[PDB]
Structure formats: C-alpha cells, structure tokens
Amino acid sequence: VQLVESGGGLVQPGGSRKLSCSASGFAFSSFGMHWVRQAPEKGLEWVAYISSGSGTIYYADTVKGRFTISRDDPKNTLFLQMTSLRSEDTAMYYCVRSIYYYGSSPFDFWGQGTTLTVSSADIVMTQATSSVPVTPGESVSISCRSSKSLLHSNGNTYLYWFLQRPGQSPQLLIYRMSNLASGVPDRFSGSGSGTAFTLTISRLEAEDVGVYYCMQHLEYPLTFGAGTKLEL
Amino acid sequence: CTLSAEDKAAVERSKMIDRNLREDGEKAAREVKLLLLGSGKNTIVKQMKTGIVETHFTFKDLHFKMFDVGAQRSERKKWIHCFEGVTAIIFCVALSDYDLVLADEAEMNRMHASMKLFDSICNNKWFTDTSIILFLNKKDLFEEKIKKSPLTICYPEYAGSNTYEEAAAYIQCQFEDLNKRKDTKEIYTHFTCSTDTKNVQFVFDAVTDVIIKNNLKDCGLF
Amino acid sequence: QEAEQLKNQIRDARKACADATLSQITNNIDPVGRIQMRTRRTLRGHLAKIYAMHWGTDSRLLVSASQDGKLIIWDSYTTNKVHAIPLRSSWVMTCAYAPSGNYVACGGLDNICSIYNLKTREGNVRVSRELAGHTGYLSCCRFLDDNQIVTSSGDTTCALWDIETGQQTTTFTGHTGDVMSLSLAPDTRLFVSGACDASAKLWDVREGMCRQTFTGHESDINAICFFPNGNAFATGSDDATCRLFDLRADQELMTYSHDNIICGITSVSFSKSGRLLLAGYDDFNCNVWDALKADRAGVLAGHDNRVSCLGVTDDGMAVATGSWDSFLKIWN
Amino acid sequence: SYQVITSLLLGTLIFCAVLGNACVVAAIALERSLQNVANYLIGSLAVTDLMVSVLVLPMAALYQVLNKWTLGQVTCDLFIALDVLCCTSSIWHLCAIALDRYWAITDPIDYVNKRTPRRAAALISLTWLIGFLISIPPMLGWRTPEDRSDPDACTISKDHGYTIYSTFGAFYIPLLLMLVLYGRIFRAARFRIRKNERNAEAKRKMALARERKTVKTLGIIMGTFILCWLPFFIVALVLPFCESSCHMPTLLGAIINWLGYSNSLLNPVIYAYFNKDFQNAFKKII
Amino acid sequence: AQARKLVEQLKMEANIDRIKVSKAAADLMAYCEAHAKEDPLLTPVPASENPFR
Ligand SMILES: C/C=C\C/C=C\C/C=C/C/C=C/CCCC(=O)O[C@H](COC(=O)CCCCCCCCCCCCC)COP(=O)(O)O[C@H]1[C@H](O)[C@@H](O)[C@H](OP(=O)(O)O)[C@@H](O)[C@H]1O
Ligand SMILES: CC(C)CCC[C@@H](C)[C@H]1CC[C@H]2[C@@H]3CC=C4C[C@@H](OC(=O)CCC(=O)O)CC[C@]4(C)[C@H]3CC[C@]12C
Ligand SMILES: C[C@H](CCC(=O)NCC(=O)O)[C@H]1CC[C@H]2[C@@H]3[C@H](O)C[C@@H]4C[C@H](O)CC[C@]4(C)[C@H]3CC[C@]12C
Ligand SMILES: COc1ccc2[nH]cc(CCN(C)C)c2c1
C-alpha cells in the first residue's frame, strides 16, 4: 500500500495548478480519498472528499467552487485542480485513503504529501495545550474539546487522533474514540465523554515526539485542532 | 437526514456493490448451463471443446458452460439439486461396453449401470422439465465387438440380428424407453465421432430446439 | 470374529442409563408462548440460490454465499453490503466467519475450502490460502482460530487445517457416509459433525478421535448446532425431525417434529438462553421450537423458496435466515 | 326501468374490468417472479385496460344512460381523446405481445442474449407514441364547424381523411401485423411439432393434441380480438362515407361501440388468467 | 490392528467421573432462569434500546 502525491510548486498570484496522487498496492476504486492541506507552521485542514465511484463529492466552505476533485479508477490516481489560487492557499496537501463500512478504519493511511506555495455551523475542535514538554517514560495525556457533541444517535463517537512526527506524514492512532488503529503500539489509548475526549499514552517513547491532531467526523465539514506538539 | 457522514459513504458503497452484483448476474444469465453425466466423456469433451469440472465453449454466438461432475462419487442426491434449471443434460454412454462387468464379482454390467443412471437422472424430481442430450460413443468398437460377441449376452430377451444399425437402434430404443415423462421432455439421441465437429452441432441444435419448445410452452402453443 | 458381541454391549449400557426423559422433567416449566417474530431487515442483492450464511462475533456482521459466484458480507443494522467477494468456483455449499472477523471461509462442490482475509492492507479481499486436501464436495468449513479451521467434506471425513502451513493437522475418518455439517463447541476443544448415514460423531480437536456417536435420526443429517452450554447439540435431517443429544448423557433427550411437517430440515440454531431452537425447513418456512418442551413457539414465513441457512447473533438480538429465493431476512 | 338496468349492467361490467386489471397489476408487482419481457408487456396492457376502465368507461356509461352529453364540449373532447388514446394503446400492446412471442419463438439466440426489459420498455413507449399520434389530430386540427354542431350529443370527428387514418392505424395495421405474426408463429409451431410402433402411435397422439391446443389458443385469441374490435372500426369506416344512406341503428351501434370496452375487459383474462404463471401466483397469494 | 486403538479410546469408561442426569437438568434450568433477563429473544427488549428498530 502506497500513495504518492505530485504537482507541487510555486504559483503566481491568482494562478492555477493541479495536484495529482497515484495509488498502488491497494484497491483504489474501493477507497474514498481525501485531500488535507497544511499551511507551514500551521495545523492540518480538510480540503475535499470524493467517494468511491465518484457518486458523492464534498468540499469545504473555503475551497468549494475554485477547487474540484476527480478520480481515475482505471489508472488508480487522484487529482485536485486549483484555480484563482490566493496567497492564503500556500500549504502542503496530503492525500488520505478511506473506506467506509462497519469495523473499518477510515484515515488509516496517508500519502507522502506535496508542497505548494502561492505568491457556519461547522464543529470546532480545540486542543487545550499547543505544546507540552515531557520526558521519555512518563505517561502523556492530551485533551481536546468539541463545540458539538460527537456522540451520534447510532451509538458511535466519531473522534479521530493523528500523529505527525517531524518530517513525516500524519499517522492514525484512534478513529472512533475507542478503537486503536493498526500498525500502532498498544500504548496509545482513547477515552472521553460525549463532548470531552483525551489521548492517554501509557508510556512515552522516542518516536512519539511530534504534533498530535484531532478531528470530528460526525459531519463532513471537518475541522482540525491547533495541535499538541510534544517536545523532550 | 439521520445518517452521519460515514453512513452515507457506507450506503454509497452498498449500492455500488448492488450495481456490480446486478451487472454480474445479468452477464451470467445470458449463458447456457449444460449438465454432463455418464463412457467416452473425456473424448466427447476433447472433441467438443478433483471436484466438478467447468468447460466453456462457444458455437455461433451462443455461449455454453458445461459442468462435468468430475467423478463426484459422494452422494449425488445431496448436490444434484445445485444444477436445477440447467438448459439440458448431456449423457454419454459407450456402446462397446455391453460386455464389461465393472468388476464387483460380475454383479453388474456397465450397460445396466448406465441405463440405471440414465433412468435415475431422467426421473429426478429436480429435472422434471429438463431435456436430455444422449450421446452414444465408441460406435466403432461396438461394431467390431458385436461381429465377434453378440449383444444378446447383454440383452438375453433380444432376438435380432447382430448388425451395427439394428443393434444401435435397439440400444437407442431401450435408452429412450427409460423416460417415464416422455411428454414433459424429449431425449435428443445422437451417435457421435462421425467427425469431431458434429457433436457440437448436435448440442447446439438440441439446445435451440429446447429453447424454442420452452418459449412455445410459455405462450401455450406447445 | 467381526466384533459381533461388541455392538450389543454399547446398546445395553446406553439403555441401562435411561431413567427419565427430558419432557417429564420440564412439565412444570411454563410454556414460552407464541413469539411475534417479524422481519426487520430484508437483504437483497443475491441473484441465485443462497446456501449458507454465518454471523460475526460482533453480532452485526454476517456473510452469505450464493451459487451466483458471490460471497457477500452484510451490515445487519444498516443493510450495507460490506464486501462482495467473487468466488472463483460458483458452487458454494458453506461459508463461515472467523471469531475475530479477520477471515472468512467458503466451500463448494469443489474439494477446496478457501480462506479470505478481510483485513488486508491491500483493502481488496484476497484468498489467503486454498485448502485442497479433500476428495469430495465440502459441506461445512468452520474456524476455531485465525490459524486453525476445521472442514467437512462429502468424502465422509473431516479435516483440521493449520492454515499457515496449509496441511491437514488432523483427519477424522470415522464417518462412513458423507458429512454434511460441522458445529464447534463453545470452548472449541471438540466439535460434532452430522453425516448422511443418519449418525453424528463427537470429535476432539486436540487428539482427533471419535469419543462417541449418535444414531437417533432415520435419514441423512443435514445440520447440527451446539447448545450454548456446550454439553449438548441439536441435529437436523431429511427425516423431517430435529433431535437433541447430550454429550454426557450419551442418549437422545428430545425430538422436534410435527405431523404437519413432512419435509427435511436444512439448518438449526439456538438462542443465547438455549430455550429456542431455530430450524429451517424445505417448506419455505422456519419453525421455532421450545428447546425444553419441543413445542413450536413460532414460524418465520416470508420466504418464496426453501430456507437453506439460518443463524442467531452472538449477542442474541436477531436471527438471520437464508433461502433459495436469494433473500436474507433479519428477524427480531 | 330500462335506464336503471342499463346503469346496473354498465357498472357491473366496469367494476369487473377494474377488478381484473387491478388484480393482474398487483400480482405482477407484489411478486418479482413474473417479471419478464412478455410478462412486462402483459402488465402494461393490464395497466392500460385499468386506465380505460377507470377513466373513460364511467363517462361513456353516463353518455349512454342519459342518451345525451351534459358535461361540456371541453370535457367531451378530453374524454374522446383519452378513450381513443387508451384503446389504441391497448391494441398496440396486443400487437407488441404478439411480436415479442414471434421473436422469442423464431429467434432463440436473440431471446437468450439480446432480449432484455429495455425491449419491453421500448415497445410500450412506441405503443403509447402511436396512440398519442392517433389522438392528437383532433386537438391540433380537424373538428370542422359541422363537427360537434349539437352540444346535446357530441360525436367523434367524421372527417374522411382523419377517420380513415385513425381506423387504419388503430385496427387494420395492427390487425394485419398481428395476423402475419401469428401465422408465422403457427407455421413455426407446426414445423417444430412435426419435426415400438405403439410408441410411435403415442407420439402421434401427443403431436395431434399439441396441434389442437395451439390451434385452440390462436383461434380463441383471434376470435375475441376480431369479434370485438372489427365491427367498431368497420362502422367507423363505413358511416363517414355512408352518411346519406346508412341509418345507424342505435342499439346495434351501441353494442358495436361497447364491443371495444368488452375487449378491454377480456384482454387480461386471455393474457394472464389463462397463463400458467399468473394463475399459480394468484393461487399462492389467494 | 484397530482393536489396540479402540481399547485405548474406550478407556474413557474409567478415565472420567460422572454426574446424574437429574443434577445436570437442575443446573441447566438454574442457569436458564438466572440469565433469562439477559436474553433479548426470550424477553423482547424495548424498542428504545433495540439496535434493529
Ligand atoms: C365447435 C363446436 C361448437 C362450439 C364452439 C363455440 C364455443 C366454443 C367455446 C370454447 C371455449 C373458450 C374458452 C376456453 C376455456 C378453457 O378451456 O379454459 C380451461 C380453464 O381455464 C378457464 O376457463 C379460466 C377460468 C378463469 C378465467 C378468469 C375469469 C374470472 C375473472 C374475470 C376478471 C374479474 C376478476 C375478478 C382450460 O384451460 P386452457 O386450456 O383454456 O388454458 C390455455 C388458454 O386457453 C390459452 O389462451 C393460453 O394461451 P395464452 O393466450 O398465451 O395465455 C394457454 O397458456 C392456456 O392457459
Ligand atoms: C364478453 C362478455 C363480457 C359479454 C360482453 C358484455 C355485455 C354484457 C355488454 C356488451 C355490449 C353491451 C350493450 C352496449 C349497449 C347497450 C345499448 C343500451 O340498451 C338499449 O337498447 C337502450 C338504448 C337503445 O335501445 O337505443 C344499453 C345497454 C346495452 C344493451 C349494453 C348491455 C351490455 C352489453 C351487451
Ligand atoms: C369525471 C368528469 C371530469 C373528468 C375527469 O375525471 N378528470 C380528471 C381525470 O380524468 O383524471 C366529470 C365528473 C363531474 C363533472 C362536472 C359536473 O357534472 C358538474 C358540472 C356540469 C357542467 O355541465 C359541466 C361542468 C361540470 C363542473 C362537470 C365537469 C366534468 C366533471 C368533473
Ligand atoms: C375513427 O374512429 C375511431 C378510430 C380509432 C379509434 N380508437 C378507439 C376508438 C374509440 C374508443 N372506443 C370507444 C372504441 C376509435 C374510433
């Protein structure tokens, strides 16, 4: 399984460019794909979502219209055309796979990411601490808050936890507030109330240093928190 | 709407799976399923082409999927129903085998066993309205052997000449007499290995006739 | 010479232990009464005769197989199809769901019980391994662990498979007739298999020998399921009756039959409490039986063809049923 | 007293037609085992017959009991157009069913491979298009000043060109095509059926029985269709060219006119109730 | 000789202790009554907490 973004560069004011991301090692057609942008020295941000088969397409309020998303199932690649790029659009975009079914782990794999430089009822996720100085071997707890209760009527809580180590793409730890993502140590744990949640680490290792991000998936206008940057 | 963000994507995936299943079912429907039983089965398959064996062959715009049971010595009564609805049943019998006894201290004759199997399949409750394509194979060896060993050994009550044509006609009549539901279904009997391409022609003709007869019956014209 | 006297001794010993039947004991038990079973979810998408289905451990996911060549996993709550796995051999006779839900098995008129990995990082479900060790059609393939699966074949012998090695860990050749079904005990230490010889044998996984045999049925046994306590199991046969057998009492306890039923049974299952026995029948209907009194507690109509398979959730919420009409319906 | 009896008879006939068509439609819909191209055409014919029974027959019955029209010119025109459209659709549905049967019988390869419900949908659309083309002319044009000159009793347009065109395209062309198709089907069936001595005699008896059965079916279908829809179009063609001479007796004309509605009622009986699958479905449901 | 295996397997006649069927039935009924409240099928759960409604 691998995802490889492409199309990065520098854009003149009001310019237009298209980013691409090829998929290999997995059934691209069966996985929904997301675009996540990240301005330098700033947190992540969902851009657009195209479901399997292109039936459902969603956009963020701040990218809708000028940004469009398309997928090429025969060629196993993803695209994101950009027009009228604004200076605020300076960010690096990460492609994320996702397949939606009971027991699945959405956002379990992230792409390499590509850099790009230029020149309303949404649930807001806030993290109490932007940075938390800690030492190895000491349990670290990261708390977050949501403006709207994430506990859905179906009985599932749609909270996600991501770790973005220095010079690495984000990695999934928790995707339903109780479930541990594959390929991660059992040290990480997740628990919380209907609105309040925290990420408790039993013991801190060297590779756990990075910025922890949270998301709500109750509704698609996803919002990223400030990010808790652990340092030693 | 009560569905969440992920529920809508799950529903989309479910309906995509529905579309794929419907497409695959439509593709599979437009194909003729033939059950093969029997005795020259391997020779017939070679000329016309450890569990059940599938053989695919096409003849003038019509696609046939042939399901040879593959020597399934298990209880046939427990899986024969899996073939309910096949267009036709191919039955292969070797004429020259009127002398063989299938060992077992000579308690049976291969011709008798073939007749019993044919009767059981024809009278099977799952094949009440299923046509049978009967093939008589190894006619050359049968002709060579009758000239030196009369078929009366296999049919003590048969009082006739040992010539090829008469013996073949008597065997065909005996096999067709087993059909206790003659009105519902017809038995398409053929003597094979005249040339390799005639067997497929006979199979195609029998399938076409069966389809036409079924269509007429649906309209009440047959 | 040919063990003439040995046969009668076992019969005499078993008869000597009969003192009181199950029906007499359960006289004081209050009747369950009619249960208003109503279909809550109707699952469509199969275009051919479905022969087998199995619940997952989570009590929400179930898998079904059909002669159309497709193996479908269902989201019971929302009826969303989880996966559609094309079977390379469109003659499936059985299917299973691993206790962890990671793997699914299927078997057909071919002699191979294929293992599918549902949790591949490739996403696409692939055949993890092919278990081609049988000489007859496979009747039931059931998982004990993620690495161990036990199979039933028309060749009259079951086989324990070490999946990672791909070789039969153990073979169970005691049956003389074709084995048609296989049910694992709650502890998975032993399992029981029914066969067309109208007998059921108790098999031990670790040692691999027939500890005991049961011969109550008068016709081919089509299905068997383990009682939730794990010390008893119920049989289903073409005799148009279901029979309850106890592993420790060694004798038949009770039978489930009615004069209005003259057709064979396709499948059997139990509820969490074990009071209800869900049995499928060739008359296109499933009859719910009081496991302690053999009274028909309900009927699950609504199928246009023979009911082929059924099963109860681990959590005991709903019971799924499958029929040759290609429709699976969830009942609660 | 006569008016009451007439109203009772017409109401009973309309109720029977509605009940039969509704039962056929319900059987086809609630049970997805009779979903076939031919069965789809039969269901479309049943729906058209139900529309005829519920929409135009009660208005026609009122027009007959009172002997005069008391609803207005606009309603008269709408009723006439709707009745013509629905009857033409029913006749062309019969023709399409005949064509589908002919194609299935004579083209087994197409039946297996190239026959799909889209074929039934296309046939139904073509039949409805032909009906609309038949029923539109009286709206856009025609209806000369002499026509509907008497508001007390309004009559269908009697223009020579329009009447010949409508009668032809509604009965004669469908009649000729249906006759040709069923003759082709009859010859095909004869060829197929025609295509130890005791066994031969038994086979001969079976062949004779099957031939008699198919002849009976074809004769029943053609006799019903003709005996119903032939007199109506014969009079519709003769009267416009026989205005001066023909007297147009009321009773005979009324019976001939209602023969078409009788055919609309009878079509489901012939095409579904006699059918084996439909009767089996009704038995299962009932 | 299969008899040597058969006798070793039949040694179960003495390898195991036994309990009367009456006690087994009593235990079964006790377990059934103890967990009756925990079986949704035996006791229809209210639709409020029913995932399938
Ligand atoms: C020559 C000497 C002098 C004599 C010659 C002159 C007179 C000769 C008269 C000949 C008789 C004509 C009618 C034939 C009756 C008859 O024999 O039918 C019998 C029983 O069926 C019913 O009766 C069906 C009974 C129920 C029908 C439904 C009606 C009730 C509800 C109406 C609607 C209202 C709903 C409540 C035997 O059945 P059948 O052989 O007639 O059935 C056949 C039918 O005739 C074919 O049309 C049909 O072909 P299709 O067009 O493709 O559908 C065939 O499939 C088959 O169904
Ligand atoms: C195939 C089966 C269903 C028989 C066909 C149905 C009959 C019961 C219908 C067909 C034509 C109908 C007739 C159509 C028109 C008339 C004229 C009218 O009666 C009169 O004679 C009064 C008017 C006049 O005499 O001018 C009203 C009833 C009657 C006889 C109808 C009675 C019912 C009939 C005979
Ligand atoms: C059934 C027809 C209307 C046509 C119809 O059914 N339209 C809807 C449809 O076809 O779906 C009749 C029933 C009663 C009739 C009305 C009543 O007879 C009252 C009144 C009588 C006047 O002479 C004409 C206007 C008017 C107001 C009539 C118009 C036509 C009506 C409404
Ligand atoms: C020209 O006279 C016609 C031509 C075609 C027609 N179709 C249907 C009708 C009348 C409808 N019922 C009253 C028979 C009709 C009349």
DSSP D148-188: T--TTS------HHHHHHHHIIIIIHHHHHHHHHHHHHHHH
Give the integer Cα–Cα distance in Å for B155 and B152: 5
CB C326 within 8 A of CB C308: no
Residue E47: which of D258, C288, C38 has the closest Cα? C38
Burial class of residue C24, CB neighbours in 10 A (0-12, 13-18, 19+): exposed
Resolution, expressed in angstroms to one decimal: 2.6
- Sheet-wide strand order for C328-331: C39-43, C328-331, C319-323, C307-312
Of D105, D196, D213, the CB nearest to B212: D105
Cα–Cα distance between C316 and C308 in angstroms, integer?
21
Instruction: Residue A73: count other Cβ atoms within 10 Å of its Cβ.
Output: 14
What is the Cα–Cα distance from C230 to C185, expressed in whole angstroms?
A: 6
Query: Please, are residues A57 and A69 in contact by the beta-carbon 8 Å criterion?
Result: yes
CA distance A159 to A149: 10
Protein residue with least CA distance to atom 13, ligand 4: D257
- D55 Cβ inside 6 Å of ligand 3: yes
**Cβ atoms of C53 and C64 closer than 8 Å:** yes
A155: nearest CA partner in chain C: C77
Helix, strand or coil, per DSSP, at residue B154:
coil
Task: Report the alpha-carbon distance of residue B12 to residue B68 in Å, rounded.
Answer: 40
Parent domain of D20: 2-285
The residue count for chain D: 286
Q: Is D160 on the interface with B (CB under 8 A)?
A: no
The span from the CA of D16 to the CA of A167, in Å, is 81
Strand C296-300 vs strand C307-312: parallel, antiparallel, or unpaired?
A: unpaired
* Domain count of the fold of chain D: 1
Q: d(Cα C177, Cα C196) in Å, to the nearest integer?
A: 5
To probe the interface with B, which of A108, A152, A217 has the most B CB atoms within 10 Å? A152
Q: Which residue has the tokens 């006119």?
A: D257
Nearest to C213 by CA among C228, C197, C227: C197
CA distance D112 to chain B (A): 6
Among E21, E22, E43, E50, most C C-beta atoms within 10 A, so best to mutate, is E21
Name beta bridge partners: C73.
Answer: C63, C83
Q: C75–A30: do the CB atoms touch at under 8 Å?
A: no
Mutation for C interface: B79, B80, B83, B125, most C CBs within 10 A: B79
Alpha-carbon gap, residue D3 to D64, rounded angstroms? 9
Q: Is D224 exposed, middle or buried (0-12, 13-18, 19+ CB in 10 A)?
A: middle
Q: Which C residues 266-295 touch E at CB under 8 Å?
A: 271-276, 292
C52 closest CA partner among C7, C3, C107 = C107
- Strand, coil or helix: D77: helix
A13 token code pair: 């004011």
3-state secondary structure B102-147: CCHHHCCCHHHHHHHHHHHHHCCHHHCCCEEEEEEECHHHHHHHHC
CATH number for D7: 1.20.1070.10
Residues of C in contact with A101 (CB under 8 A): 75, 80, 82-83
Q: Give the number of residues written for chain E.
A: 53
Residue among E5, C132, C102, B220 at smallest CA distance from D42: B220
Of all residues in chain A, the one with the smallest CA distance to C61 is A102
CATH code reported for the domain at C1-331: 2.130.10.10
d(CA A183, CA A2): 15
> Taking a C-beta distance cutoff of 8 angstroms, is the pair D63, D69 a contact?
yes
Residue C255's SS3 state is: strand
Q: E37 has which bridge partners?
A: none
Q: Which residues contact B18 (CB under 8 A, 6 or more apart)?
A: C44, C45, C81
What is the distance in A from the centroid of ligand 3 to the CA of D19?
A: 24
Which one of the ligands is nearest to D261 CA? 4
Q: Domains in chain B, ordered, with CATH?
A: 32-219 (3.40.50.300)
Contacts of B71 in chain C (CB under 8 A): none
Per the CB < 8 A criterion, the answer to whether A42 and A130 are in contact is no
Question: Which candidate, C310, C314, C312, C246, places its Cα nearest to that of C324?
Answer: C310
Q: How far apart are CA B75 and CA D196, in angstroms?
A: 36
Asked if D213 lies within 8 A of B220 by C-beta distance, the reply is yes
Show Cβ contacts of residue B78 under 8 Å, excluding neighbours closer than 6 positions: C154, C178, C180, C196, C220
What's the token pair of residue A91? 């960010």
Report whether C102 contacts C117 (CB < 8 A). yes
Task: Using the mean position of ligand 4's atoms as its centre, give its distance from the Cα of residue D84 in Å.
Answer: 5
- Triad C292, C293, C295: Cα angle to 5°: 125
Q: In this structure, what token pair is assigned to residue C329?
A: 């319906």
Is C77 an interface residue toward A (CB < 8 Å)?
yes
Nearest to D105 by CA among D50, D182, D170, D161: D182
Q: Chain D: residue nearest B33 by CA?
A: D112
Closest C-alpha to C277, from C298, C259, C250: C298
- Contact status, residue B162 vs residue B148, Cβ threshold 8 Å: no
Distance CA C252, CA B23 (A): 49
CA D220–ligand 1 middle distance (angstroms): 8
**Residue pointed to by tokens 């659309």:** D125
Report CA(D168)–ligand 4 centroid distance (Å).
11
Residue type, A185: P
Tokens read off for D260: 């078409």
Helix (H) or strand (E) holding B164: helix B164-177
Length of chain C, in residues: 332
Task: Give me the domain span that covers residue E13.
Answer: 1-52
State whether B62 and D218 contact (CB < 8 Å): no
CA-proximal residue: ligand 1, atom 19 (nearest) = D274
The answer to whether D76 and D84 are in contact (CB under 8 A) is no
CB atoms within 10 A of CB C97: 24
Q: Which residue of E has its CA nearest to C204?
A: E9
Distance separating alpha carbons of residues A17 and A34, to the nearest angstrom: 18
D275 touches chain B (CB under 8 A): yes
Structure tokens given for C116 = 């599918």
Q: Of the candidates D104, D113, D217, which has its C-beta nearest B220's C-beta?
A: D217
The residues on A that touch B, with CB distances below 8 Å, are 30, 32, 51-53, 55-56, 98-102, 106, 152-154, 156, 158, 217-220
CB atoms within 10 A of CB B45: 18
Question: Of D39, D35, D40, D49, whose CA–CA distance to D91 is shortest?
Answer: D49
DSSP state of C14: H
Query: CB of C207 within 8 A of CB of C188?
Result: no
Contact D6 CB / ligand 2 (< 6 Å): yes
Å from CA of D83 to ligand 1 middle? 27
- Classify burial at C187, counting beta carbons within 10 Å of its beta carbon; exposed 0-12, middle 13-18, buried 19 or more: exposed
Q: Where in chain A is the domain with CATH 2.60.40.10?
A: 2-118, 125-230
**Residue partners of B72: CB distance under 8 A and separation at least 6:** B51, B52, B79, C109, C136, C137, C154
- Whether B7 sits inside 8 A of A154 (CB atoms) is yes
Candidates C236, C266, C265, C230; CA nearest to C248 is C230
- Interface residues on B facing A, Cβ-Cβ cutoff 8 A: 2, 4-10, 12-13, 15-16
Alpha-carbon dihedral sign for residues C27, C32, C33, C34: negative
Query: Measuring CA to CA, which residue among C294, C202, C216 is closest to residue C251?
Result: C216
Chains that touch A (3 or more CB pairs under 8 A): B, C
| Backbone angles phi and psi of A25, in degrees to 5 | 80, 0
Q: Quick one: tokens of C31?
A: 């009747």
Of B177, B182, B216, the CB nearest to D105: B216
Q: How far apart are CA D80 and CA D155, in angstroms?
A: 9
DSSP labels for D92-136?
Answer: HHHHHHHHHHHHHHH-HHIIIII--HHHHHHHHHHHHHHHHHHHS
**Amino acid sitting at position B61:** D
Strands A125-127 and A114-118: unpaired
End-to-end, the C-alpha distance of chain D in Å comes to 38
CA distance A121 to D129: 51
A2-118: which CATH number, 2.60.40.10, 3.40.50.300, 3.50.50.60, 3.40.50.800? Answer: 2.60.40.10
Please state, in angstroms and rounded to a whole number, the distance separating the CA atoms of residues D53 and D113: 37
Q: Which ligand lies nearest to the CA atom of residue D26 in the structure?
A: 1
CATH 1.10.3210.10 fits A125-230, yes or no: no
| C183: nearest Cα among C141, C217, C216, C220 | C141
The last residues before gaps in chain D (C-N over 2.5 Å) are 195
Q: Integer distance in angstroms from the first to the last C-alpha of chain B?
A: 55
Task: Return phi, psi of residue C51, to 5°.
Answer: -110, -25
**Which residue carries 């437009």 as its tokens?**
B30
**Among C29, C248, C273, whose Cβ lies nearest the Cβ of E42?**
C273
Q: How many CB pairs under 8 A join B and D?
A: 62
Rounded CA gap, D281 and D277, in Å? 6
The set of residues, in sequence order, having a beta carbon less than 8 Å from that of C254 and lying 6+ positions away, is: C21, C22, C23, C243, C244, C294
Q: Can you read off the two tokens belonging to residue A174?
A: 């928790």
Looking at the CA of B219, which ligand is closest? 1
Q: Give one word for C314, left, alpha or beta, with left for phi > 0 and alpha for psi -120 to 50.
A: alpha
Q: Is the CB of D222 under 6 A from ligand 3?
A: no
Number of H helices, E strands in chain B: 6, 6
d(CA B150, CA B157): 12
What are the tokens at C22? 């199950």
CB contact under 8 A, B6 and A154: no
Give the residue from C194, C156, C154, C192 showing the smallest Cα distance to C175. C156
Query: What is the number of the ligand 1 atom nearest to the C-alpha of B221?
Result: 49
E15-32 residues labelled b (16+ CB within 10 A) or e (exposed): eeeeeebeebbeebeeeb
Cα gap C124→A24, rounded to integer Å: 12
SS3 content of chain E, % helix, strand, coil (to 5): 60, 0, 40
State the method: cryo-EM
Indicate the SS3 state at residue C203. strand
The answer to whether residues C191 and C143 touch, using CB atoms and an 8 Å cutoff, is: no
Tell me which H or E stretch contains E25.
helix E21-34
Contact check, Cβ <8 Å, C229/E40: no
Q: Collect all residues of chain B within an 8 Å Cβ-Cβ radius of residue D278.
A: none
Are C317 and C295 in contact, with CB atoms under 8 Å apart? no
Ligand 2 center to D16 CA (angstroms) = 15
